[PDB]
Design a protein around this ligand. Sequence first.
Ligand SMILES: COCc1nc(C(=O)NCc2ccc(F)cc2)no1
Length: 149
Amino acid sequence: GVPTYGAIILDETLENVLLVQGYLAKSGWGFPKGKVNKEEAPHDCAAREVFEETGFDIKDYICKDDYIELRINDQLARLYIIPGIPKDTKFNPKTRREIRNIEWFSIEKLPCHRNDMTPKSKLGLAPNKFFMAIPFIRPLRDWLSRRFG
Ligand SMILES: COCc1nc(C(=O)NCc2ccc(F)cc2)no1
């Protein structure tokens, strides 16, 4: 799987994260990220994908050791953590053929797992529009505890 890079952008209170909503297979909400190009450095891919999807340039705020990285089905996704971005920042994708909407979400209200269907005695998970974000929520909460308190 080709690795993906992007960012977890938080506001100044550390309460809210910035998610983007795509189309079709990417119809739910997730952190801005995308596939690394041949010979492209991780930090440069993260800034490019984030700038293409949000219009916000993270390059001057990226800290090299501040990221969460997950291997999901043998694909690596690494999101650089970018705190302190003002809530009134104007975000605009380059490509509205790819991005429907861009919003702040309260971290404490985002789920960190999908719910089962044990009310229905059926296996599997109910749909959740935050599916792609979910795997990063607990690790992010733990990372913010250790880094900030
Ligand atoms: C069931 O898994 C498929 C799925 N993927 C997604 C998804 O990535 N949404 C966020 C997003 C990130 C970057 C973009 F450019 C566009 C959208 N939502 O559902």
